[PDB]
Amino acid sequence: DTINSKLALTMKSGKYVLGYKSTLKTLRSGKAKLILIAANAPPLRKSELEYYAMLSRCSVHHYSGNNIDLGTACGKLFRVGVLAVIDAGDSDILAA
RNA sequence: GGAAGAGUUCUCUUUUCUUUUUAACAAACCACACCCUGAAAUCGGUUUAUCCGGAGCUAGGGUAUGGUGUUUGGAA
């Protein structure tokens, strides 16, 4: 409950990308500080994003719900399997 | 409509009826899936029938599949 609230606060203050290859690009640039993975993501998709996160020294979180739940928590109306939070803004999702 | 012949026709009737072809094959060219840039809702594109889109839309540039069509050759 704390984390999703921090995610919502990030999305109005921190800078974000909600998409598969945009997250790949941000991880490649190394800017993305934390990546959220939907639980229903493919085992292949999870692994290479995890590999990129470990290469870029990026914190990784597994959002327990499916991608529809991540979209509802994210507040938008499109499914997001994987997203990147690059700055926390007013929120403090990076530390906790 | 054009042409050819056969009509009909005191007169009316540019009119009545009939015909007017290009094969297999061989050449050059001629539009659905995917890729690249892209990151989107103020929701856009779109079917006769709303389908798809952060599992990446619209848009731009490409790639392939050529159903076909164009020009001939065959062929006068």
PDB file of C-alpha atoms (C1' of nucleotides) in Angstrom:
ATOM      1  CA  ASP A   1       0.000   0.000   0.000  1.00  0.00           C
ATOM      2  CA  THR A   2       2.884   2.378   0.700  1.00  0.00           C
ATOM      3  CA  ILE A   3       4.685   1.472  -2.538  1.00  0.00           C
ATOM      4  CA  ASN A   4       1.753   2.102  -4.883  1.00  0.00           C
ATOM      5  CA  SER A   5       1.131   5.473  -3.227  1.00  0.00           C
ATOM      6  CA  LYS A   6       4.803   6.325  -3.750  1.00  0.00           C
ATOM      7  CA  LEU A   7       4.384   5.195  -7.361  1.00  0.00           C
ATOM      8  CA  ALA A   8       1.386   7.498  -7.816  1.00  0.00           C
ATOM      9  CA  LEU A   9       3.267  10.461  -6.329  1.00  0.00           C
ATOM     10  CA  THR A  10       6.206   9.709  -8.629  1.00  0.00           C
ATOM     11  CA  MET A  11       3.955   9.790 -11.684  1.00  0.00           C
ATOM     12  CA  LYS A  12       2.954  13.403 -11.001  1.00  0.00           C
ATOM     13  CA  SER A  13       6.437  14.544  -9.926  1.00  0.00           C
ATOM     14  CA  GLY A  14       9.090  12.025 -10.959  1.00  0.00           C
ATOM     15  CA  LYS A  15       9.938  11.260 -14.565  1.00  0.00           C
ATOM     16  CA  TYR A  16       8.759   7.933 -15.953  1.00  0.00           C
ATOM     17  CA  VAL A  17       8.450   5.608 -18.930  1.00  0.00           C
ATOM     18  CA  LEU A  18       5.693   2.954 -19.027  1.00  0.00           C
ATOM     19  CA  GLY A  19       6.639   0.571 -21.829  1.00  0.00           C
ATOM     20  CA  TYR A  20       8.799  -2.390 -22.815  1.00  0.00           C
ATOM     21  CA  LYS A  21      11.433  -0.981 -25.144  1.00  0.00           C
ATOM     22  CA  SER A  22      11.409   2.499 -23.611  1.00  0.00           C
ATOM     23  CA  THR A  23      12.418   0.761 -20.385  1.00  0.00           C
ATOM     24  CA  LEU A  24      15.049  -1.124 -22.386  1.00  0.00           C
ATOM     25  CA  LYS A  25      16.384   2.158 -23.781  1.00  0.00           C
ATOM     26  CA  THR A  26      16.427   3.850 -20.368  1.00  0.00           C
ATOM     27  CA  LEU A  27      18.185   0.844 -18.835  1.00  0.00           C
ATOM     28  CA  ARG A  28      20.639   0.936 -21.739  1.00  0.00           C
ATOM     29  CA  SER A  29      21.287   4.627 -21.084  1.00  0.00           C
ATOM     30  CA  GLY A  30      21.631   3.687 -17.409  1.00  0.00           C
ATOM     31  CA  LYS A  31      19.389   6.513 -16.200  1.00  0.00           C
ATOM     32  CA  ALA A  32      16.493   4.315 -15.011  1.00  0.00           C
ATOM     33  CA  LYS A  33      16.887   3.897 -11.255  1.00  0.00           C
ATOM     34  CA  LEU A  34      14.044   1.433 -10.597  1.00  0.00           C
ATOM     35  CA  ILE A  35      12.082  -0.877 -12.903  1.00  0.00           C
ATOM     36  CA  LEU A  36       8.645  -2.318 -12.113  1.00  0.00           C
ATOM     37  CA  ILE A  37       7.851  -5.723 -13.641  1.00  0.00           C
ATOM     38  CA  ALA A  38       4.307  -7.050 -13.858  1.00  0.00           C
ATOM     39  CA  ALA A  39       3.978 -10.569 -12.479  1.00  0.00           C
ATOM     40  CA  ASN A  40       2.301 -11.855 -15.653  1.00  0.00           C
ATOM     41  CA  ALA A  41       5.305 -10.806 -17.753  1.00  0.00           C
ATOM     42  CA  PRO A  42       6.859 -13.605 -19.855  1.00  0.00           C
ATOM     43  CA  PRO A  43       9.751 -15.500 -18.249  1.00  0.00           C
ATOM     44  CA  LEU A  44      11.915 -14.421 -21.184  1.00  0.00           C
ATOM     45  CA  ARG A  45      10.890 -10.768 -20.879  1.00  0.00           C
ATOM     46  CA  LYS A  46      11.497 -10.756 -17.118  1.00  0.00           C
ATOM     47  CA  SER A  47      14.954 -12.295 -17.468  1.00  0.00           C
ATOM     48  CA  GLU A  48      16.534  -9.923 -19.996  1.00  0.00           C
ATOM     49  CA  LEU A  49      15.110  -6.869 -18.233  1.00  0.00           C
ATOM     50  CA  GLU A  50      16.522  -8.299 -15.002  1.00  0.00           C
ATOM     51  CA  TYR A  51      19.834  -8.813 -16.803  1.00  0.00           C
ATOM     52  CA  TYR A  52      19.775  -5.203 -18.009  1.00  0.00           C
ATOM     53  CA  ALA A  53      18.876  -4.026 -14.503  1.00  0.00           C
ATOM     54  CA  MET A  54      21.844  -5.887 -13.022  1.00  0.00           C
ATOM     55  CA  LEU A  55      24.171  -4.510 -15.708  1.00  0.00           C
ATOM     56  CA  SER A  56      22.939  -0.949 -15.095  1.00  0.00           C
ATOM     57  CA  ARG A  57      22.878  -1.380 -11.279  1.00  0.00           C
ATOM     58  CA  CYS A  58      19.149  -0.659 -11.248  1.00  0.00           C
ATOM     59  CA  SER A  59      16.834  -1.641  -8.417  1.00  0.00           C
ATOM     60  CA  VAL A  60      14.172  -4.121  -9.536  1.00  0.00           C
ATOM     61  CA  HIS A  61      10.694  -4.667  -8.097  1.00  0.00           C
ATOM     62  CA  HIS A  62       8.156  -7.385  -8.930  1.00  0.00           C
ATOM     63  CA  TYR A  63       4.639  -5.932  -8.861  1.00  0.00           C
ATOM     64  CA  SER A  64       2.563  -8.795  -7.466  1.00  0.00           C
ATOM     65  CA  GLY A  65      -0.515  -8.138  -9.587  1.00  0.00           C
ATOM     66  CA  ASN A  66      -0.818  -8.686 -13.316  1.00  0.00           C
ATOM     67  CA  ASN A  67      -0.351  -5.954 -15.926  1.00  0.00           C
ATOM     68  CA  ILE A  68      -3.994  -4.844 -15.710  1.00  0.00           C
ATOM     69  CA  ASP A  69      -3.440  -4.290 -11.980  1.00  0.00           C
ATOM     70  CA  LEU A  70      -0.280  -2.290 -12.665  1.00  0.00           C
ATOM     71  CA  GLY A  71      -2.235  -0.107 -15.086  1.00  0.00           C
ATOM     72  CA  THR A  72      -5.005   0.461 -12.548  1.00  0.00           C
ATOM     73  CA  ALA A  73      -2.424   1.276  -9.873  1.00  0.00           C
ATOM     74  CA  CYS A  74      -0.612   3.477 -12.394  1.00  0.00           C
ATOM     75  CA  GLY A  75      -3.918   5.272 -13.024  1.00  0.00           C
ATOM     76  CA  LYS A  76      -3.747   5.043 -16.818  1.00  0.00           C
ATOM     77  CA  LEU A  77      -6.093   3.007 -19.015  1.00  0.00           C
ATOM     78  CA  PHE A  78      -3.446   1.058 -20.963  1.00  0.00           C
ATOM     79  CA  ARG A  79      -1.705  -2.129 -19.865  1.00  0.00           C
ATOM     80  CA  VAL A  80       1.929  -1.738 -18.773  1.00  0.00           C
ATOM     81  CA  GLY A  81       3.912  -4.938 -18.305  1.00  0.00           C
ATOM     82  CA  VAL A  82       7.120  -3.121 -17.353  1.00  0.00           C
ATOM     83  CA  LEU A  83       7.814   0.480 -16.358  1.00  0.00           C
ATOM     84  CA  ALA A  84      10.853   2.509 -15.311  1.00  0.00           C
ATOM     85  CA  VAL A  85      10.986   5.197 -12.639  1.00  0.00           C
ATOM     86  CA  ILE A  86      14.091   7.284 -13.332  1.00  0.00           C
ATOM     87  CA  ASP A  87      13.499  10.019 -10.750  1.00  0.00           C
ATOM     88  CA  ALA A  88      11.270   9.789  -7.687  1.00  0.00           C
ATOM     89  CA  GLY A  89      10.302  13.472  -7.702  1.00  0.00           C
ATOM     90  CA  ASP A  90       8.339  14.374  -4.592  1.00  0.00           C
ATOM     91  CA  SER A  91       7.867  10.662  -3.892  1.00  0.00           C
ATOM     92  CA  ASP A  92      10.496   8.563  -2.111  1.00  0.00           C
ATOM     93  CA  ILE A  93      10.080   5.244  -3.931  1.00  0.00           C
ATOM     94  CA  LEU A  94      13.825   5.055  -4.605  1.00  0.00           C
ATOM     95  CA  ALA A  95      14.898   4.704  -0.971  1.00  0.00           C
ATOM     96  CA  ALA A  96      12.110   2.401   0.240  1.00  0.00           C
TER      97      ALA A  96
ATOM     98  C1'   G B   1     -20.759   6.076 -80.340  1.00  0.00           C
ATOM     99  C1'   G B   2     -17.046   4.106 -85.160  1.00  0.00           C
ATOM    100  C1'   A B   3     -17.088   0.822 -89.250  1.00  0.00           C
ATOM    101  C1'   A B   4     -19.217  -3.054 -92.439  1.00  0.00           C
ATOM    102  C1'   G B   5     -23.379  -5.485 -94.710  1.00  0.00           C
ATOM    103  C1'   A B   6     -28.646  -6.651 -94.827  1.00  0.00           C
ATOM    104  C1'   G B   7     -33.126  -4.328 -94.047  1.00  0.00           C
ATOM    105  C1'   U B   8     -37.625  -0.897 -93.522  1.00  0.00           C
ATOM    106  C1'   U B   9     -38.566   4.083 -95.685  1.00  0.00           C
ATOM    107  C1'   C B  10     -44.801   8.508-100.264  1.00  0.00           C
ATOM    108  C1'   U B  11     -43.525  10.847 -95.795  1.00  0.00           C
ATOM    109  C1'   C B  12     -41.499  10.219 -90.248  1.00  0.00           C
ATOM    110  C1'   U B  13     -37.274   7.515 -88.658  1.00  0.00           C
ATOM    111  C1'   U B  14     -28.404  10.080 -87.762  1.00  0.00           C
ATOM    112  C1'   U B  15     -33.238   4.645 -87.737  1.00  0.00           C
ATOM    113  C1'   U B  16     -34.130  -1.505 -87.620  1.00  0.00           C
ATOM    114  C1'   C B  17     -31.223  -6.190 -87.394  1.00  0.00           C
ATOM    115  C1'   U B  18     -26.034  -8.727 -87.353  1.00  0.00           C
ATOM    116  C1'   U B  19     -20.635  -8.630 -86.466  1.00  0.00           C
ATOM    117  C1'   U B  20     -16.442  -5.978 -84.527  1.00  0.00           C
ATOM    118  C1'   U B  21     -10.653 -11.848 -81.903  1.00  0.00           C
ATOM    119  C1'   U B  22      -5.841 -12.320 -79.257  1.00  0.00           C
ATOM    120  C1'   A B  23      -3.944 -18.478 -76.530  1.00  0.00           C
ATOM    121  C1'   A B  24      -0.129 -21.136 -73.709  1.00  0.00           C
ATOM    122  C1'   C B  25       4.439 -19.157 -72.744  1.00  0.00           C
ATOM    123  C1'   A B  26       8.509 -15.178 -72.185  1.00  0.00           C
ATOM    124  C1'   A B  27       9.988 -10.171 -70.852  1.00  0.00           C
ATOM    125  C1'   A B  28      10.571  -5.476 -68.183  1.00  0.00           C
ATOM    126  C1'   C B  29       7.645  -2.324 -64.547  1.00  0.00           C
ATOM    127  C1'   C B  30       2.720  -1.619 -61.318  1.00  0.00           C
ATOM    128  C1'   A B  31      -0.286  -2.847 -54.100  1.00  0.00           C
ATOM    129  C1'   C B  32      -0.903  -7.702 -46.644  1.00  0.00           C
ATOM    130  C1'   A B  33       3.078  -9.133 -42.986  1.00  0.00           C
ATOM    131  C1'   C B  34       7.471  -7.224 -41.015  1.00  0.00           C
ATOM    132  C1'   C B  35      11.579  -3.610 -39.985  1.00  0.00           C
ATOM    133  C1'   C B  36      13.593   1.675 -38.670  1.00  0.00           C
ATOM    134  C1'   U B  37      12.619   6.652 -36.359  1.00  0.00           C
ATOM    135  C1'   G B  38       8.893   7.420 -32.763  1.00  0.00           C
ATOM    136  C1'   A B  39       6.481   7.475 -27.555  1.00  0.00           C
ATOM    137  C1'   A B  40       0.773   8.062 -27.620  1.00  0.00           C
ATOM    138  C1'   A B  41      -5.528   9.206 -23.954  1.00  0.00           C
ATOM    139  C1'   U B  42      -7.804  15.815 -24.990  1.00  0.00           C
ATOM    140  C1'   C B  43      -7.706   8.761 -27.148  1.00  0.00           C
ATOM    141  C1'   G B  44      -6.398   8.240 -32.011  1.00  0.00           C
ATOM    142  C1'   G B  45      -6.567   5.120 -36.953  1.00  0.00           C
ATOM    143  C1'   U B  46     -10.698   2.366 -39.037  1.00  0.00           C
ATOM    144  C1'   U B  47     -14.844  -1.827 -41.232  1.00  0.00           C
ATOM    145  C1'   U B  48     -20.658  -2.807 -44.584  1.00  0.00           C
ATOM    146  C1'   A B  49     -19.994  -5.540 -40.151  1.00  0.00           C
ATOM    147  C1'   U B  50     -15.213  -1.578 -33.626  1.00  0.00           C
ATOM    148  C1'   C B  51     -10.677  -3.785 -34.321  1.00  0.00           C
ATOM    149  C1'   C B  52      -6.019  -2.860 -32.671  1.00  0.00           C
ATOM    150  C1'   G B  53      -2.398   0.134 -29.926  1.00  0.00           C
ATOM    151  C1'   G B  54       3.526   1.038 -23.879  1.00  0.00           C
ATOM    152  C1'   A B  55       3.242  -7.031 -25.882  1.00  0.00           C
ATOM    153  C1'   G B  56       4.607   0.423 -28.827  1.00  0.00           C
ATOM    154  C1'   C B  57      -1.058   3.848 -31.811  1.00  0.00           C
ATOM    155  C1'   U B  58      -1.542   7.737 -35.381  1.00  0.00           C
ATOM    156  C1'   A B  59       2.600   9.780 -38.562  1.00  0.00           C
ATOM    157  C1'   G B  60       7.215   9.405 -41.645  1.00  0.00           C
ATOM    158  C1'   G B  61      10.790   6.186 -44.229  1.00  0.00           C
ATOM    159  C1'   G B  62      11.534   1.167 -45.686  1.00  0.00           C
ATOM    160  C1'   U B  63      11.244  -4.766 -46.636  1.00  0.00           C
ATOM    161  C1'   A B  64       8.821  -8.737 -48.604  1.00  0.00           C
ATOM    162  C1'   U B  65       4.639 -11.218 -50.406  1.00  0.00           C
ATOM    163  C1'   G B  66       2.172  -9.139 -56.779  1.00  0.00           C
ATOM    164  C1'   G B  67      -3.846 -10.847 -56.330  1.00  0.00           C
ATOM    165  C1'   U B  68      -3.498  -8.022 -60.373  1.00  0.00           C
ATOM    166  C1'   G B  69      -2.814  -4.152 -63.900  1.00  0.00           C
ATOM    167  C1'   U B  70       0.762  -1.337 -67.875  1.00  0.00           C
ATOM    168  C1'   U B  71       3.904  -2.121 -72.149  1.00  0.00           C
ATOM    169  C1'   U B  72       5.269  -5.562 -75.642  1.00  0.00           C
ATOM    170  C1'   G B  73       6.837 -10.367 -77.649  1.00  0.00           C
ATOM    171  C1'   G B  74       3.933 -14.660 -79.389  1.00  0.00           C
ATOM    172  C1'   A B  75       0.986 -11.770 -83.672  1.00  0.00           C
ATOM    173  C1'   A B  76      -1.191 -11.128 -87.827  1.00  0.00           C
TER     174        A B  76
END
